[PDB]
Amino acid sequence: TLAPNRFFFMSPYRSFTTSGCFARFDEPAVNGDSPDSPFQQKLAALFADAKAQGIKNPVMVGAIPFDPRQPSSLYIPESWQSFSRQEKQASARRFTRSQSLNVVERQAIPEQTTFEQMVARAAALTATPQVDKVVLSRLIDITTDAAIDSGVLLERLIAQNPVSYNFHVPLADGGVLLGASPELLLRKDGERFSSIPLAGSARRQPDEVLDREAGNRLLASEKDRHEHELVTQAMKEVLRERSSELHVPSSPQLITTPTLWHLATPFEGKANSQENALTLACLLHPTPALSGFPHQAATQVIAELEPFDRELFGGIVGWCDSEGNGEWVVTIRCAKLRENQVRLFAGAGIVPASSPLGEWRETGVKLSTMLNVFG
Numbered sequence: 001t002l003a004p005n006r007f008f009f010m011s012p013y014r015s016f017t018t019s020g021c022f023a024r025f026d027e028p029a030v031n032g033d034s035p036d037s038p039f040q041q042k043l044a045a046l047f048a049d050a051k052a053q054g055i056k057n058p059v060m061v062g063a064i065p066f067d068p069r070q071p072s073s074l075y076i077p078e079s080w081q082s083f084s085r086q087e088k089q090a091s092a093r094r095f096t097r098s099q100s101l102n103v104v105e106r107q108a109i110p111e112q113t114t115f116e117q118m119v120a121r122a123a124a125l126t127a128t129p130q131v132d133k134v135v136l137s138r139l140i141d142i143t144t145d146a147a148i149d150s151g152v153l154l155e156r157l158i159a160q161n162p163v164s165y166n167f168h169v170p171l172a173d174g175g176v177l178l179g180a181s182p183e184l185l186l187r188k189d190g191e192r193f194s195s196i197p198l199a200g201s202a203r204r205q206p207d208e209v210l211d212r213e214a215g216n217r218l219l220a221s222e223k224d225r226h227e228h229e230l231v232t233q234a235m236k237e238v239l240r241e242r243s244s245e246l247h248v249p250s251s252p253q254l255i256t257t258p259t260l261w262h263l264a265t266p267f268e269g270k271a272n273s274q275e276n277a278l279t280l281a282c283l284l285h286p287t288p289a290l291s292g293f294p295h296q297a298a299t300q301v302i303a304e305l306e307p308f309d310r311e312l313f314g315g316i317v318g319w320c321d322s323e324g325n326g327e328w329v330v331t332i333r334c335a336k337l338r339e340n341q342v343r344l345f346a347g348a349g350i351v352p353a354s355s356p357l358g359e360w361r362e363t364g365v366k367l368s369t370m371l372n373v374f375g
């Protein structure tokens with residue numbers, strides 16, 4: 001299985017692994033949408049260093065945190081290795097062995113009543129003109145007795161989530177950021193780009209007809225359509241100023257994960273160039289699916305209600321090459337592991353039609369993707 005110091009990315013676009021490490025890159029990604037920002041200038045330079053030093057076709061991979069004022073977890077590997085997503089999906093339709101793991105401690109940060117009161121405050125605030133949507137999140141901390149094998153976990157992740165954007169990111173503190181993301185934030189392929197934001201959620205059902213009825217009810221739910229509209233209206237505005245052309249559908253489609261129905265709107269467009277995967281990714285992130293709307297207002301509520309720092313959770317994860325192509329997906333349905341400690345994360349968009357218990361339960365089902373991976 002995959003060694004923990006290797007990047008792994010599984011996607012219908014480009015799926016690959018990396019090896020070794022040429023140079024790390026931790027410049028904060030704030031203002032990274034401007035080609036004249038320190039982030040972009042330093043990026044170009046390192047790609048230049050890489051080629052001079054004889055790195056062929058250098059790639060920048062890893063993760064950027066929710067608040068891009070914080071350092072990035074990005075690097076250029078010594079080498080990378082394509083593989084076929086399809087071959088990997090076929091190989092994962094198997095019984096997936098598991099690491100025997102003992103729990104020494106488990107802890108919900110916060111616990112149910114506290115989270116419910118947080119949702120109620122945020123909901124009440126969204127009832128005022130001051131903000132329209134706040135994304136609130138919570139964690140499950142688990143401590144084992146043994147170092148966790150991130151490679152065995154990845155095999156389970158893939159087997160349980162063969163379709164999503166599956167990532168395994170080595171981290172500078174020795175940890176691994178692992179996950180099964182359903183949300184494309186930015187793909188760039190030549191001059192064209194796309195983004196498939198999600199927001200609005202309904203639990204899958206084992207019964208075929210009930211499953212379909214759950215999806216249908218989601219498309220008819222005013223709360224979830226409102227939650228989703230605030231996201232797409234935001235990104236449409238942002239991308240208007242920046243794209244030669246832009247296609248956005250007028251209503252969402254349905255997408256599934258193993259646990260959830262989601263509302264999804266596909267954006268496609270042509271990039272003004274002098275643009276790359278990261279200039280556009282930093283432009284968009286975070287959307288109101290992960291921060292809220294208006295952005296700065298929502299991030300203030302988040303800072304005042306959440307009893308923890310998100311760090312990489314709710315950021316983006318992916319890759320950019322020196323030609324400006326790349327793909328960035330939202331850092332959700334995911335876990336940070338280091339030695340015998342795991343932190344799982346989930347958020348949910350809060351609007352005036354949000355109930356405290358409903359969003360505790362929605363974040364619960366979101367947490368279940370990684371809880372399933374761990375058993």
Ligand SMILES: C=C(O[C@H]1C=CC=C(C(=O)O)[C@@H]1O)C(=O)O
Pocket residue numbers: 135183198199200201262288289290332333345346347348349366
């Ligand atoms: C913040 C998360 O999801 C976002 C995107 C998909 C569904 C979401 C929702 O319905 O609240 C969130 O906007 C998460 O999965 O932890």
Ligand SMILES: [Mg+2]
Pocket residue numbers: 199200201227348349362
């Ligand atoms: Mg939601």
